[PDB]
Amino acid sequence: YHGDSVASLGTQPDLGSALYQENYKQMKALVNQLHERVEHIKLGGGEKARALHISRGKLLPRERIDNLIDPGSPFLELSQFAGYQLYDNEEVPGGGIITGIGRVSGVECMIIANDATVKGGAYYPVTVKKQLRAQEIAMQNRLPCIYLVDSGGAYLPRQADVFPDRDHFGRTFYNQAIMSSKNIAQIAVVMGSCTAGGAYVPAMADENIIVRKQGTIFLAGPPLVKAATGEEVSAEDLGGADLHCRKSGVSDHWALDDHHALHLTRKVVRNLNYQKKLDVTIEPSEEPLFPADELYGIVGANLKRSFDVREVIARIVDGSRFTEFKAFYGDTLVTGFARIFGYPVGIVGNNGVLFSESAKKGTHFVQLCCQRNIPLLFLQNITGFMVGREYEAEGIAKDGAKMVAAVACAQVPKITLIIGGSYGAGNYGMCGRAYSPRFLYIWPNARISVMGGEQAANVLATITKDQRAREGKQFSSADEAALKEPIIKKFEEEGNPYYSSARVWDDGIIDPADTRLVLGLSFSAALNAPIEKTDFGIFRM
Amino acid sequence: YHGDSVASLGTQPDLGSALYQENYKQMKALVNQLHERVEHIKLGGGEKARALHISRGKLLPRERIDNLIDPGSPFLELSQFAGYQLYDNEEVPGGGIITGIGRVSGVECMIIANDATVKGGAYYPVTVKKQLRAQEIAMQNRLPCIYLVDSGGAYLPRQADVFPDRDHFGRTFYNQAIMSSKNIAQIAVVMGSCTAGGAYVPAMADENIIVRKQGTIFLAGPPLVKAATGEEVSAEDLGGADLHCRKSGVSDHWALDDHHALHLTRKVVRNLNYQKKLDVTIEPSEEPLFPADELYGIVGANLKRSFDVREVIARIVDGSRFTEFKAFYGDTLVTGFARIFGYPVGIVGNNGVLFSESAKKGTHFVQLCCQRNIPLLFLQNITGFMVGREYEAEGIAKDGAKMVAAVACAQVPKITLIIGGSYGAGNYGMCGRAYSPRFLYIWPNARISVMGGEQAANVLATITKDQRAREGKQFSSADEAALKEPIIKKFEEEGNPYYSSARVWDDGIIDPADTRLVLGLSFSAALNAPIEKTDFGIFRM
Amino acid sequence: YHGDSVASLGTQPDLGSALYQENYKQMKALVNQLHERVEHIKLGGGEKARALHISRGKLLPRERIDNLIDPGSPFLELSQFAGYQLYDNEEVPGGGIITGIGRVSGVECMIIANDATVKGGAYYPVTVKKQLRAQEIAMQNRLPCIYLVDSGGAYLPRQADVFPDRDHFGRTFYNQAIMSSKNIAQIAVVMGSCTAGGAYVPAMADENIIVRKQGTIFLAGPPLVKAATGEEVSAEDLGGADLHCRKSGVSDHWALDDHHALHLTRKVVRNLNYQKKLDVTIEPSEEPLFPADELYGIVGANLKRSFDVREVIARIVDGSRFTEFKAFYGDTLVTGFARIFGYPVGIVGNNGVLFSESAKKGTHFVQLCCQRNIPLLFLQNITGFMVGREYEAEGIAKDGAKMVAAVACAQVPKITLIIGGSYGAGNYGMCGRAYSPRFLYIWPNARISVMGGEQAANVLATITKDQRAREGKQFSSADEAALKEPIIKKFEEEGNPYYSSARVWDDGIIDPADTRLVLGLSFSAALNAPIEKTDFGIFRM
Amino acid sequence: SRKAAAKESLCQAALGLILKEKAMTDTFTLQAHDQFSPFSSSSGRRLNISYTRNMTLKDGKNNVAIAVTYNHDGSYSMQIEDKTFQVLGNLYSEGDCTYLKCSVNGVASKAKLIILENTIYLFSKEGSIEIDIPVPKYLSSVGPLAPMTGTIEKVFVKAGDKVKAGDSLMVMIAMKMEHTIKSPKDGTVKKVFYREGAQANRHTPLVEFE
Numbered sequence A, B, C: 001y002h003g004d005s006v007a008s009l010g011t012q013p014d015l016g017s018a019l020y021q022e023n024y025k026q027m028k029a030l031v032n033q034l035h036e037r038v039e040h041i042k043l044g045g046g047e048k049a050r051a052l053h054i055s056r057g058k059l060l061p062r063e064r065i066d067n068l069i070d071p072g073s074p075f076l077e078l079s080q081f082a083g084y085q086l087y088d089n090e091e092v093p094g095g096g097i098i099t100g101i102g103r104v105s106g107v108e109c110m111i112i113a114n115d116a117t118v119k120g121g122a123y124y125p126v127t128v129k130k131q132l133r134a135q136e137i138a139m140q141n142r143l144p145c146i147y148l149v150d151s152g153g154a155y156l157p158r159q160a161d162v163f164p165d166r167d168h169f170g171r172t173f174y175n176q177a178i179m180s181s182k183n184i185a186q187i188a189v190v191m192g193s194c195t196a197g198g199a200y201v202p203a204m205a206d207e208n209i210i211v212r213k214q215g216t217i218f219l220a221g222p223p224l225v226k227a228a229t230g231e232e233v234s235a236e237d238l239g240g241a242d243l244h245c246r247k248s249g250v251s252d253h254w255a256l257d258d259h260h261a262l263h264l265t266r267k268v269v270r271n272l273n274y275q276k277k278l279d280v281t282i283e284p285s286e287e288p289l290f291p292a293d294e295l296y297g298i299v300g301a302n303l304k305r306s307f308d309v310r311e312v313i314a315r316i317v318d319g320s321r322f323t324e325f326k327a328f329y330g331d332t333l334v335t336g337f338a339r340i341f342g343y344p345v346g347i348v349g350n351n352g353v354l355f356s357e358s359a360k361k362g363t364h365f366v367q368l369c370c371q372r373n374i375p376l377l378f379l380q381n382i383t384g385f386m387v388g389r390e391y392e393a394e395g396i397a398k399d400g401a402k403m404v405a406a407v408a409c410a411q412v413p414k415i416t417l418i419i420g421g422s423y424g425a426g427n428y429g430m431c432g433r434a435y436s437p438r439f440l441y442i443w444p445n446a447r448i449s450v451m452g453g454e455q456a457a458n459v460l461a462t463i464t465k466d467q468r469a470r471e472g473k474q475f476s477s478a479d480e481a482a483l484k485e486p487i488i489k490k491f492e493e494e495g496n497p498y499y500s501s502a503r504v505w506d507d508g509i510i511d512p513a514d515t516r517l518v519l520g521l522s523f524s525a526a527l528n529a530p531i532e533k534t535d536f537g538i539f540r541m
Numbered sequence D: 001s002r003k004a005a006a007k008e009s010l011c012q013a014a015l016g017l018i019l020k021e022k023a024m025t026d027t028f029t030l031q032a033h034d035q036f037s038p039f040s041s042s043s044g045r046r047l048n049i050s051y052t053r054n055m056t057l058k059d060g061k062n063n064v065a066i067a068v069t070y071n072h073d074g075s076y077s078m079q080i081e082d083k084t085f086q087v088l089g090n091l092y093s094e095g096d097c098t099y100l101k102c103s104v105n106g107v108a109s110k111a112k113l114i115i116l117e118n119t120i121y122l123f124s125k126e127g128s129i130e131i132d133i134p135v136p137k138y139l140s141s142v143g144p145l146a147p148m149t150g151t152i153e154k155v156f157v158k159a160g161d162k163v164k165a166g167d168s169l170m171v172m173i174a175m176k177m178e179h180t181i182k183s184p185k186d187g188t189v190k191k192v193f194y195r196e197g198a199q200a201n202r203h204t205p206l207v208e209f210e
């Protein structure tokens, strides 16, 4: 039937209130700062290396992805802020690599493009981190993976941090070997010069493409040949495109220039015989009834004041409709059913500290979402986990452990978004990074640490007051201020969205408004895989 | 029938040759150094903290594991050298934690014991690394996991390197939640005081044990209660064993002291209803015909001289018998069939640089071992991958890629042992760390880097001579020596077994002689899991 | 997206060139000869037996299949040339039986009709061969099978060649028993008189139909009753339609005449509850850009001259589009991706002798087609396998063995078409008859033998010259001509399309132009079955 | 004679092409299982940044580069040489004809949009303009080697000749198989390296173009 009317969420905020004006101004300042930083990261290695990249007839890497995907298609870039002030004097825009999800010939493909304008395309340790994150996104979601090889190889001064470990560079080839055994098609397009470790990236591909007078593959370079042998050889005579397409047989297609290689890539993807099948149910899409500059005004920059998380769920779902599950029992957690772009979503959000009733409500809701095969969207705004003697007497530990067990055993596509603070073990309960969500984005006001700066400063102040009163010396106000400034300063600097996103702890600082669109894009890629049956472990009753 | 006679490997080495005397003396020096270093690491946090640990009626952690396992059972410790000179002035013996495989009530269990004598049992980032390595060893091999909780919590100054990432501390609880869904039993024994993040380690256990007046569980400590509330509470009144066994219900068994807790642990393991089933075939065991102080004399300390890898395979297999597969085609790789302790092993070893014929022989042998469900033991002694213009013209890249694809897709229990150098992408082909072997041990003469020190020094010398001759300045012998000393020094320091094993890049520097016994122990644990069917990807022909 | 433009194959041939005129004239002569031979085979047993068949109110068998299938539907006859000069003075048109694939009530059914005008409908050994071929076509493709029983029984003088072996007559009932266990519906329509071995063909049917005063079933005839007992009984009193529908219960439906029986057959097929499901992806169909009288001109009759196989692939695929895989490495084999009638096809064709690079390219392409579940169309134009001392030194044997292993392990619907010669073990590599393709058609210029006539004549001439020079006698030109005429004559006669298609070595000589339509029909039937996962054996590297 | 197109007319041609590509995207979606989904809207919505498409249109003999920025509100900002136009519009149908509805810098217009192979036709009340889409080299490109090691029967051409593509240059027999070489290339032969009756080898050059 699906025809009767249903009430909807949402409250029109007081746009004249000075709290709204201050929250709106401060969040707008954060978003403008984000805008100008990503416009500086977009240029890449600078105009000198861009001139030397276009003087060789090479398309710039963002132009390569622009000519590769379907015309007019949205590109979802992942981890644009990697390597941001991560090395001391070495400015590495984008990590050196451009990874994202796009629509190629009607198929959602995962694209990995070596930016050669930044340090010769050399692999930094953060470049390997970003690449392995992209490859497990492609394996979780069953996305066909496209590589645009134009590297330079590991970065020798940092070679330890690139070479031997489990999640170091060689894992890349592991990821291409396993994904080929699962029918997830791997295409490599040699547009540059992979050398001596990176030459396995074209050689382990199910179907390969190379470019004449521009693309070289060899396991050993002309310096290594001139040192070990003494035979002078060039690059094109040693591992050029004519040699590899005609004699050795490493490359499978041959391309005149860059546009021909991207055209051939689209042909190879079109002949993959892939047909998308959704097992979830879809309703005809709709729109939120409230705009998202109101999310600028509602949420704001200060983490001291709380807000209602329902005013976020009114702004991001279809029709602003939301079936709230167990609405009065433990209202520090808001769990309900909504739809984004037709997809059914089970939305879990925070409203305060987590009592035991909140953890029981969360465990029940995650079990419902895994029994009905509904995806889960977690929204994190956490302060902590409700300290007190009575609550530890009640067994607040086993209830948080039940929520952690049900979140970790869940097989549905989970997506985390950190709309505020994310501190401590509550971060584990609300499906943080270590619990394998599909995607994890953050907002530019978020903070993430092991505790807040004030919590660390105040428990260290009380503990040192306790041990000095056992000692006997005078612990004054100035000693307390000299005790409290570096703890607050360190937890503020290292809890930033830019500190967390300089690594690949999160998949990218996103704008609040774009939040709605971004979630839809994320969920679309996550529905490219069939949904497995969830089986939980032992619930500690 | 199994009765007819078969020739055997092995050559009696020239014990009077001065090469044998020098190789034996230098390897004996390495092994004695290893012995005295591990005897210093065994004491732990020192005599002051050991006195304050035994003054509270607590068993020391090595005594706990000694009273937990079956009487007379061998214990296989993993990563004894973690944290060795890894932090600047902070000496962290064993990482702060003692992980290994033992025999409890007839079952091979994986034991994880928090050493509380070293920095209060606080979690360093290497402690989290070592713990997560132990937990995936337990998940690969289906070993029931026992935790002896006596922590202190994360290490705040290092909190970033412990808290948020994917393979940071919270992953631990993910690993206990997934393993409980697979019937891999998790026992936690609270012998100490887990606090506020570590309290999930007892709370997520399938069956728990706690100790009176000694074991406290709480999600919030008395400093946090005294700061947030202002209520003074102790540790035992807040989260003691009587409160948890009687009112809250977190603990399932109750123990008088440490011996009672280990006795109750053995009871809980005995009532797990686990019965080991081998799917491989077993023959009655035998012994090598040659001792392993001969391996001291054969292998030695210098990596310049080669040796025969067959003289290693004569020293570690049963009966010194070895069916060599494809013995003449590409004899820089030695692949054959042997047995260790009755178990059938397919042994792959090196003898030089890897030509394309060696990679084809390796791919064929790994396909045979996965076709017959035989385990694989890889022995790494690699210099490189055979540079030359002709060999890149032949397609040496696609042959190494075929070996990497067949090694990465293989489902049999693989075990790597690095008996010499392990440099570069050959390390990826011979199943290094990133390709998920079961166990990876090294010998105390090994080196592992992205290239040798001489390769890096010499290719950088030739490249800088090439660019200065394009420039015009004089590059003399002294400029070359000032160019070649820090490259050699850095690649020698960071290629060590102690540098690689201070992290958890390898599961431990082992003695050469003990090598035989250690492999048998490793293979026994790896046969606790049924063997899955291997399916490879696309072989680049 | 699927919208951008792509280059296409095809060259307009030189229609004024005298090579084109001669090739066109000779291929047109072959096709006209084919036309008049099949128009003589169509009449059947001749006008006397056709008058005695229509004098009993019986529809002629081609009229039976014309009134059985959907109106206007194309019928794909298989093996129209069986029994062509296969017996000495016995002219057996069509083998005595008419087998094909048709569209009945919307379902692709396989129809087997006993032509009773040719020798009383008696079973010749080639009739049993043709019938068992039809039944395994129905089992491979999951086609419901319809029999129009109007036999006479085995052919006694030939009884050995019909009775005892594995693939002799009794296998028929095996094939109906196995296919009924798999839900492949078997309908028998007794329109004639099956007798004493053929009476199992109606009795083992899932649903049966019989005709009054015309259809008799008995396990023993009135001669056998009159000999063994001495009781005179007729045919209709012994095993008529009234007796079987009313007392014995062998028949399930009862029919007045032939039209009623075919109407009831269409009812029985309509109530089978079968719904076709395609697992491949379909694109909207198109047409070739070049006509196929150009295939007459291009290909011609002489096997000495080569042609381009790409000019065949321009003439048979949709849009003349063809994504060529690995186009320069080993260009004696042409492998690519195309579409026929919307279906995705992987096309493998020849261009010369098979070097080792050609076999490696073929193995890679067959692995891609089985990895993506794409059907395979093999086009055979083979001379041999590249003799030489160097090529045997390279290991040309193991590369052909790799292609044979990947072709034999492949689970996709393979279809072979022999557009030219097919000699020797290359015939095994390019998926000949013994490697179980779905269908195998040939063109009227093809040749198929164990070697060419000139190869056999010339190696026998050189070997006999070698042994006579060891002997000493004079081996002149006339002795060589008397040595070379019967070898050439025998290999020319027994390599014909009519010699190969008089047996059921191939499913029928087809016209070149009709080739396009025929392949589409074949592929449609082959997609009536779901596609299984391919698992290969051991690739000899 | 033909007159050059105005920059506003090039904006209309670029907009019609972009909307035609959208139409193809929409009719693909109508056949998809994954209906209503994002990626189907040809919005060019990049994350935190804008998308600019650089296309070239050929106006008569001359090429013009148009940089099309995709705006968040569905409008386009098209910069042709230096001048930026604010370009909005859509497609609508009247019977069997497709019309392009434009608004360029506040100036509304309507023209019939017909795109036939490469040529964009705009039919308005002020004239008719034909703008061509350039064809890339790899769609318009469509010396020789010996196929095996054989002896040559007949040469055909010498130096100073001219052949056009698909011409017989040589015939060679290799283990009794007559191979007629042909020309994919074009021009004039400068040297024929093997005279008739000589032995040519595998992948050996036969003739040359200077």
Ligand SMILES: CCC(=O)SCCNC(=O)CCNC(=O)[C@H](O)C(C)(C)COP(=O)(O)OP(=O)(O)OC[C@H]1O[C@@H](n2cnc3c(N)ncnc32)[C@H](O)[C@@H]1OP(=O)(O)O
Binding pocket: A116, A118, A119, A120, A121, A122, A151, A152, A153, A154, A155, A156, A157, A193, A195, A196, A197, A198, A221, B424, B425, B450, B451
């Ligand atoms: C055997 C096992 C392995 O596979 S480990 C191999 C280690 N990798 C290498 O040494 C490969 C060498 N890399 C290169 O491509 C060479 O430097 C060559 C071919 C000369 C690069 O040529 P060109 O295209 O002009 O360089 P570029 O302008 O892109 O260089 C950018 C800047 O980065 C540097 N760079 C590049 N690769 C490395 C590297 N692997 N290790 C250290 N530095 C590297 C370049 O020197 C260059 O420095 P700058 O930014 O121009 O000042």
Ligand SMILES: CCC(=O)SCCNC(=O)CCNC(=O)[C@H](O)C(C)(C)COP(=O)(O)OP(=O)(O)OC[C@H]1O[C@@H](n2cnc3c(N)ncnc32)[C@H](O)[C@@H]1OP(=O)(O)O
Binding pocket: A424, A425, A450, B116, B118, B119, B120, B121, B122, B123, B151, B152, B153, B154, B155, B156, B157, B195, B196, B197, B198
């Ligand atoms: C929710 C997030 C998490 O799960 S991570 C939270 C961070 N963890 C903590 O801060 C827990 C506090 N650790 C403790 O156990 C307390 O220090 C108390 C209870 C006082 C330890 O008492 P006691 O048994 O006397 O200490 P000990 O002799 O074992 O201490 C050894 C030395 O190490 C230190 N230590 C211990 N834990 C930490 C820690 N987490 N961060 C920093 N330092 C730590 C102790 O201060 C002590 O220093 P010292 O070696 O004696 O000079």
Ligand SMILES: CCC(=O)SCCNC(=O)CCNC(=O)[C@H](O)C(C)(C)COP(=O)(O)OP(=O)(O)OC[C@H]1O[C@@H](n2cnc3c(N)ncnc32)[C@H](O)[C@@H]1OP(=O)(O)O
Binding pocket: C116, C118, C119, C120, C121, C122, C151, C152, C153, C154, C155, C156, C157, C195, C196, C197, C198
């Ligand atoms: C126990 C296992 C077995 O089932 S072995 C049993 C062997 N089968 C038989 O002998 C069945 C006998 N075949 C017949 O149908 C009889 O010949 C009868 C009923 C008389 C056929 O009648 P009518 O319809 O007039 O014959 P027709 O004109 O169709 O005969 C065509 C020509 O072929 C002959 N023919 C037929 N069947 C066989 C046979 N099995 N063996 C040998 N010859 C056979 C007929 O004699 C007849 O010869 P002609 O072409 O008319 O000169």
Ligand SMILES: *C(=O)CCCC[C@@H]1SC[C@@H]2NC(=O)N[C@@H]21
Binding pocket: A353, A383, A384, A385, A386, A387, A454, A455, A458, A459, B220, B227, B228
């Ligand atoms: C003041 O400086 C902060 C004291 C503790 C922080 C509060 S107490 C309740 C919340 N839960 C938690 O674990 N920390 C938060």
Ligand SMILES: *C(=O)CCCC[C@@H]1SC[C@@H]2NC(=O)N[C@@H]21
Binding pocket: A227, A228, B353, B383, B384, B385, B386, B387, B454, B455, B458
């Ligand atoms: C001398 O200083 C070393 C030069 C290069 C090292 C050699 S060359 C052959 C081996 N393979 C390889 O890649 N490195 C080794």
Ligand SMILES: *C(=O)CCCC[C@@H]1SC[C@@H]2NC(=O)N[C@@H]21
Binding pocket: C353, C383, C384, C385, C386, C387, C454, C455, C458, D175, D176
């Ligand atoms: C001449 O009479 C024929 C000699 C042999 C036939 C040729 S040689 C190369 C082709 N490969 C093959 O096995 N036979 C063909």
